[PDB]
């Protein structure tokens, strides 16, 4: 009967209708109610006496700035409550304590600055909690102590500076934790104590100066991210206490030296990307890790590749080793899953026919800016399909044609002293080619 809409399955929606108070005249048996995008400033004492059977209540974007402590009384069956984008300057401690059956509580997008000590007390059934985009200055340790059953907590976009010891000690059931976009500088030794069930930990965009030693207390981690930070070293065995790690985000940092065995015994890691780790000399001792699909090391001083690379990493697909000082190449046989190989800007000085032998599913090969001096005739014969092949800026006197009939895009720019010309009878599928000397393309 209200000016807003309705639904057959005991649901009422009144979003964006410009209401100033809760709508009256609705059915007593209402299971869901939406009042999100109306302009309501306060909830009186007797607001929700007419809806004893509410299960979901939405108030996002109401510009709500006051909640009477008795407003939510009587909603024993409430399960979902959203209050984001309002002007609640603090967590409504008194108002929400009567919600025994509450399971989801959204309070993000507010201007929360203080959390009373007795907040969230009595919320036995709470399982999800949002506190993003607030002006919080420290972790509410004691208010969180009253939520042993929490399963997902997020405190992003706040102004957190440091996390004290035993901050989340009683949240043994937590499995998701977000802390990105904060100003966190230091993590105490036992800050994450008791988070034995945590599965994802987000620490992006913070100001960490040293690697967090606390993550050694997390035995069930699966996803970890600390990019956009100021971390410079991953000393050694940092992930020793996280055997189940799968994804690591560390690709935007002033990384200078990652440990030789930093990534070691991580049997479930998928992607490993390290950029700008200049001081690294040896190859990462990534024994045990045999589930890699992408391996990217750039900007380092690696002088050699180990022969056992993909006879161990049989699942490897992308192998980027640009920059660095790779002088010799180990035989890539056993690299059956390699789709892309990148070796540009290296010290590679020759490609003997036994180097790229045995690769089948190769798709792209990059050898630009190297010092390749010679290639044996049959070096390219053994590989299967090829779509890209760059040997720009090397000292190639001659370039073989056998095995490149399937070639699509070819780039020899700057290969001066490559006098003797190619021919279209072997190179048949090309429609992209750039050659040193001049008018080498009069045949094509």
């Amino acid at each position: 009967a209200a000016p807003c809409s309705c639904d057959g399955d005991r649901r009422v929606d009144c979003s964006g209708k410009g209401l100033t108070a809760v709508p009256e005249g609705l059915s007593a048996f209402t299971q869901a109610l939406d009042i999100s995008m109306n302009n309501i400033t306060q909830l009186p004492e007797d607001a929700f006496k007419n809806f004893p059977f509410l299960e979901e209540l939405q108030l996002a974007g109401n510009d709500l700035s006051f909640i009477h402590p008795k407003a939510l009384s009587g909603l024993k069956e409430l399960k979902v409550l959203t209050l984001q984008n309002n002007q609640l300057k603090t967590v409504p401690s008194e108002a929400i304590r009567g919600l025994s059956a509450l399971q989801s509580l959204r309070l993000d997008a507010n201007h929360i600055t203080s959390v009373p000590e007795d907040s969230f007390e009595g919320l036995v059934q709470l399982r999800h909690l949002w506190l993003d985009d607030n002006s919080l200055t420290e972790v509410p340790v004691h208010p969180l102590s009253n939520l042993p059953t929490l399963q997902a907590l997020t405190l992003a976009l706040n102004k957190i500076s440091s996390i004290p010891d035993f901050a989340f000690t009683n949240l043994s059931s937590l499995v998701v934790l977000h802390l990105h976009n904060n100003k966190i500088r230091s993590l105490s030794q036992h800050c994450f104590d008791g988070l034995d069930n945590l599965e994802t930990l987000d620490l992006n965009y913070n100001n960490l100066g040293e690697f967090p030693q606390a993550i050694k207390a997390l035995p069930s981690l699966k996803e970890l991210g600390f990019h956009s930070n100021s971390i410079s070293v991953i000393p050694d065995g940092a992930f020793d206490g996280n055997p189940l790690l799968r994804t690591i985000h560390l690709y935007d940092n002033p990384l200078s030296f990652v440990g030789n065995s930093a990534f070691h015994n991580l049997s479930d890691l998928h992607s490993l990307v390290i950029r700008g780790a200049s001081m690294v000399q040896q190859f990462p001792n990534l024994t045990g890790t045999v589930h890699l699909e992408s391996l990217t090391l750039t900007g380092t001083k690696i002088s050699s590749i180990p022969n056992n690379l993909c006879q161990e990493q049989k699942m490897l697909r992308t192998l980027d080793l640009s920059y660095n000082n790779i002088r010799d190449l180990p035989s890539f046989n056993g690299c059956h899953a390699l789709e892309e190989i990148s070796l540009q800007r290296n010290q590679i000085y020759q490609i003997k026919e036994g180097t790229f032998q045995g690769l089948i599913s190769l798709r792209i090969l990059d050898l630009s800016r190297n010092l390749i001096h010679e290639i044996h005739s049959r070096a390219f014969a053994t590989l299967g399909p090829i779509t890209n092949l760059d040997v720009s800026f090397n000292e190639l006197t001659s370039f073989p044609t056998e095995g490149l009939n399937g070639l699509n895009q070819l780039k020899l720019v700057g290969n001066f002293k490559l006098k003797e010309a190619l021919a279209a009878k072997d190179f048949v599928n090309l429609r992209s080619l750039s050659v040193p000397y001049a008018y080498q393309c009069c045949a094509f």
Epitope: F66, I67, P69, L88, T90, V91, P92, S93, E94, A95, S114, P116, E117, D118, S119, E121
Partner: nanobody
Framework: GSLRLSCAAS????????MGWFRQAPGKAREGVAT???????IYADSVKGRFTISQDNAKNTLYLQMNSLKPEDTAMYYC???????????????????WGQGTQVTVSS
Amino acid sequence: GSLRLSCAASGYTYSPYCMGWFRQAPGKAREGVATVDLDGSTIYADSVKGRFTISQDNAKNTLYLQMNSLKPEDTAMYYCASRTRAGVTCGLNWAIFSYWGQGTQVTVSS
């Protein structure tokens, strides 16, 4: 103006943990005016630091708030609020109080 903003608690007499005065401009949020706890400790707002004064008569639960030389900004509706249990720190936070009054109007002109 010698404006005495009295209050009265009718429920129970034994000293509640905390009692504050708050004010509300039309349509905006509730921001605090003053607070007093069981020990007699007192807190005021920055705009209220000197003009007003919160008092109390514990034996009778008549809790006054004295205002003099009211600024023209001081037009609002004032609420007397209380709390019983001790599980929080006293302060000018509207979310900790348990009982709220119907408030009254104070319109300062000139």
